[PDB]
Ligand binder design. Structure first.
Ligand SMILES: [Zn+2]
Ligand SMILES: [Zn+2]
Lengths: 100, 285, 285, 100
């Protein structure tokens, strides 16, 4: 499955000033069943990262800070970290801003 | 209460009086309007500037911080008279806390949030919700900014039975992250970002008043072309290595009140008496 | 030329000095920078305010109009010192014309357009093109506004052989419509619209200077992630009967120099000597 | 062909404060060959209009003022008023703003 992944809200700083990310995924996960978004978090944080982990994912889960959107749709109703990724989906990782 | 327009006022407002939606009728809305801004630095200034200019009846401001001796509230108000002498500016020359925040809001028709501290940001929504007031919240750090219009129109606490505007908790459920928090003092700020966001904040507030969007609807549902009950969270990223990009303004439509929200949802253990006492202690960090 | 930073300056700019892209290195760019604003009302004010604040070296302003006795140039400059004492503000206390416009631009590094008259808007691009200067143009009437970044980096007149930034004529080819023209005096203006647009204009100008985007590229082509040669035309519509809508900010990518453009294209009959004489008489209406 | 049509830049004022417009078209024009965008101008101005003609189209052609975009793409390279409309195309009519 080839998808486009985006960052914003002072997150992309982690990924070397890059917001737009296109990488094709394996259709099947490690245990042979279809890619979930538990996968994308693991793949991204381990390989796509360009910085020290604390700021994106901690204790085997995303930091409460960030929101995830699938085709600009709430991640929680559509699968909530166990979502069979689609062949051209868009996933957005935005760190909620609490300064002003 | 004022029913008529001064030659003084008619002269000042004529430039925006002759626009679709903003008659002698639409302008008087703003003149009798009472808006409050929580936070005087950064987003406060431009927000306040464009309310003042618009001739918002009364404009409140809340900041105990001084300039970089002289409180920033006072500095700013002094500024605003120059823009528009006619409005009544009301300085809360201290910092908001649970003990008072209840007191500081009950008067005002529309609440703007520029507070810059996560704990405070949650506090306001809670109160705003309970007291039954619409919040235009907005945030800015470093190269990025974002804005949203919550609890408009203001739907009573726990009324999940009707399509109902989301609270700040409903949105941004439990985070703030404890060690992922950067401040405007900590991480800096480009000017045009906080500027865009403030000006827009005023924008949303003015809209709410002029078109009367804080007014509950007729058993009829609320039009979704207002984007009130399902409101966009506009995210502005400022890239100083690029021109205006298609992905400069991204508009993330948001969900109506989360039926299970701690605060505005069904079976909330949140009371105005509570926050006063230190009840949901804002120790989330 | 200035190589070092005053404790005075270091104190004022520290808030935006500590942001990615904006070091002692990035800040000095702005301090040696020379920006010009054509038009002092409406878009002028906020544009100028956020350049001033940013500490743009020299800030020019051009408007022969008075307030509603005292020229609006003077009024505004008086305002700006309050925001930032350190910049050199330079008032052209008259109105721009073909006879002078050549003279009024040749000094300045970046040109902002806030002129509010269609004829003038075309004139500037022509000159800006010929003299070889980048234009951040912006417009606002009533409930709607829009912005674009032309001729950045500035590609010489007629050089169609290379991927090259579009002029105002290249974009907006022959229109202005003669009887479809509304002015800001004619049709009014909501505050947050002109505010958003001005603040953004400053935004684009600052970017150009800080990241050095007016600098021609290395036989190498220009990165398209700058959105300079193929620049977005951001359109802001302000609906005062709705909240921020997904279709609030729409971003229309635009074409590089039209090879057949009257002015910046191949076989242009446009000369700096020409405009002076009254050559392309701005009788298009 | 069902398409969505939009207005902006102080044009929609003509169409009663409405920007978004969805109406399905006949696939074939009056003379039986496929719908062009010469058609949409004629259909819109005659039926969809809510105001007096001078401001949108004059002398059997759009006012020089306005730009037309097809899927946010310049109209001029893609057909320029003689464009076979597609089954889900987006056409945008924005009056160029010359005030400030
Ligand atoms: Zn809630
Ligand atoms: Zn050209």
């Amino acid at each position: 499955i080839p998808i486009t992944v985006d960052f914003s809200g002072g997150l992309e700083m982690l990924f070397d000033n890059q917001r737009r990310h296109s990488i094709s995924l394996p259709a099947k996960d490690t245990e042979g069943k279809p890619v979930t978004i538990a996968f994308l978090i693991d793949y991204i944080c381990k390989k796509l990262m360009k910085d020290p982990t604390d700021l994106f994912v901690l204790d085997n889960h995303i930091r409460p800070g960030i929101l995830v959107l699938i085709n600009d749709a709430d991640w929680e109703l559509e699968g909530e970290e166990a979502y069979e990724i689609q062949p051209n989906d868009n996933i957005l990782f935005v760190s909620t801003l609490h300064g002003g | 209460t004022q029913k008529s327009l001064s030659k003084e006022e008619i002269e000042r407002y004529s430039r925006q009086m002759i626009v679709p939606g903003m008659g002698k009728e639409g302008q008087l809305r703003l003149m009798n309007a009472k808006v409050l801004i929580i936070g005087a630095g950064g987003l406060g200034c431009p927000a306040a500037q464009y309310l003042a200019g618009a001739g918002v009846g009364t404009i409140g401001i809340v900041d105990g911080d001084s300039v970089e001796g002289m409180l920033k509230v006072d500095s700013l108000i002094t500024h605003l008279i120059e823009i528009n002498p006619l409005p009544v500016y009301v300085p809360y020359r201290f910092d908001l806390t649970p003990q008072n925040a209840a007191q500081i809001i009950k008067p005002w028709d529309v609440i703007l949030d520029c507070t810059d501290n996560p704990a405070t940001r949650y506090l306001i929504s809670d109160v705003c919700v309970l007291l039954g007031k619409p919040l235009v919240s907005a945030a800015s750090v470093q190269k990025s900014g974002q804005l949203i219009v919550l609890n408009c129109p203001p739907t009573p606490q726990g009324v999940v039975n009707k399509k109902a505007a989301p609270c700040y908790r409903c949105c941004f459920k439990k985070p703030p992250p404890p060690s992922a928090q950067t401040s405007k003092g900590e991480a800096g700020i480009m000017g045009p970002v906080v500027g865009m966001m403030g000006v827009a904040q005023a924008g949303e507030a003015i809209k709410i008043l002029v078109s009367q969007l804080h007014m509950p609807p007729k058993g009829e549902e609320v039009s979704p072309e207002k984007n009130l009950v399902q409101p966009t969270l506009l995210i502005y990223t400022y890239d100083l290595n690029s021109a205006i990009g298609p992905y400069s303004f991204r508009a993330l439509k948001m969900g109506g009140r989360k039926k299970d929200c701690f605060a505005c949802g069904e079976n909330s253990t949140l009371t105005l008496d509570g926050i006063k006492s230190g009840n949901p202690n804002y120790v989330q960090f």
